[PDB]
Design a protein around this ligand. Structure first.
Ligand SMILES: Nc1ncnc2c1ncn2[C@@H]1O[C@H](COP(=O)(O)OP(=O)(O)O)[C@@H](O)[C@H]1O
Ligand SMILES: [Mg+2]
Length: 339
């Protein structure tokens, strides 16, 4: 997990040296000691960066690496986390971090609060993470640390861009607030995952709403790619006239895996989303639509007909190379393929 205890022990040039290790690892993974010194130069003028280095090493924000010629330090995952938080703090998006952290298979979910005391969600992407069970909590070593960090950066950038596009089009998604490195700060939605919804008296309405969402997404050029009972939140509201009836409003989250309706495998991704919904509705509410499909060939005819803005171009905006997209999709497909 992630502990933010040390976060306040850190001085101004502890941050500067940490940041210097980050910048110097742009090219190579190990950053030689005298290159930290040069990058960290304030005026400058180190002048006691050597001490900061030990502080950061002790706190596990960087780690010493001795190699044939390259003798220096690398940033750790904790170090990147800290750098992200610092950026959110400095831009005043995050004032405090909650005691409650949700450790997931591909991301960590934290609750944070700003200076006004408003609670928001901090999502930290964790591509590469694997856990080991003893036969009688780690990262998969087919990639270096810098590669996993790079991929999680791409994941956060992608998700944030899609959350912006979707939010501005009027889709029910969290409000995106800020993005730094592998992290996103977004609004806290007052809804819980559909997986745990305790009672649905009218499955057919909710089903129709979810199906309309998949079709609405497709009309805007998108396929969610992980559309299931964990990525659908249900807002519950008691009706004004009688409180016995509860109106249910679905909200969608979790977008680093979204694909365009033009993706070579779009039909498989479309069909898979729909089948996930049907499966869930069959096992959880014993509900089965009499309505066939919807089928991909139907959906594709609808993009982007009428006013439909193509949201699958939000990625072009950032500086997302085709290489970055292939890198990310490969890492993602690998994650979900081995669940
Ligand atoms: N904005 C939010 N508001 C409320 N709950 C959220 C929000 N984002 C995530 N969650 C909770 O965290 C869980 C995981 O979030 P998600 O974005 O799906 O992360 P992961 O990529 O690890 O699946 C969700 O199922 C939900 O319980
Ligand atoms: Mg999810």
């Amino acid at each position: 997990k992630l502990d933010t205890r040390a976060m306040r022990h850190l001085t101004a040039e502890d941050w500067r040296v940490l940041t210097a290790v980050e910048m110097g690892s742009k090219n190579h993974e190990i950053v030689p000691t005298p290159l930290i010194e040069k990058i960290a130069r304030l005026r400058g003028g180190s002048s006691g960066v050597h001490k900061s280095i030990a502080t950061l090493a002790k706190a596990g924000l960087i780690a010493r690496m001795k190699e044939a010629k390259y003798d220096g330090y690398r940033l750790t995952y904790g170090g990147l986390d800290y750098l992200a938080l610092h950026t959110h703090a400095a831009r005043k998006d995050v004032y405090s971090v909650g005691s409650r952290i949700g450790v997931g298979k591909e991301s960590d979910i934290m609750i944070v609060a700003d200076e006004k005391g408003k609670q928001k969600v901090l999502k930290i992407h964790r591509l590469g993470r694997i856990s080991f069970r003893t036969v009688k909590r780690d990262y998969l070593r087919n990639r270096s640390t810098g590669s996993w960090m790079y991929l999680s950066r791409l994941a956060a950038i992608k998700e944030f861009a899609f959350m912006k596009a979707l939010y501005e089009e009027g889709f029910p998604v969290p409000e995106p607030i800020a993005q730094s490195r592998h992290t996103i700060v977004m609004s806290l939605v007052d809804a819980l995952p559909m997986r745990q919804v305790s009672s649905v008296p009218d499955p057919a309405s909710l089903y129709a709403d979810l199906i309309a969402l998949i079709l609405r997404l497709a009309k805007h050029g998108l396929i969610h790619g992980d559309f299931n009972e964990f990525n659908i939140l249900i807002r519950e509201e008691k009706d004004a006239e009688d409180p016995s009836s509860i109106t249910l409003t679905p909200i969608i989250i979790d977008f680093p895996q979204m694909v365009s309706m033009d993706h070579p495998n779009a039909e498989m991704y479309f069909d898979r989303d729909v089948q996930c919904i049907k499966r869930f509705f069959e096992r959880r509410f014993h509900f089965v639509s009499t309505t066939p499909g919807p089928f991909y060939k139907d959906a594709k005819k609808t993009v982007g007909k009428d006013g439909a803005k193509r949201l699958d171009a939000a990625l072009e905006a950032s500086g997302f190379t085709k290489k970055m997209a292939k890198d990310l999709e490969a890492a993602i497909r690998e994650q979900q393929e081995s669940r």
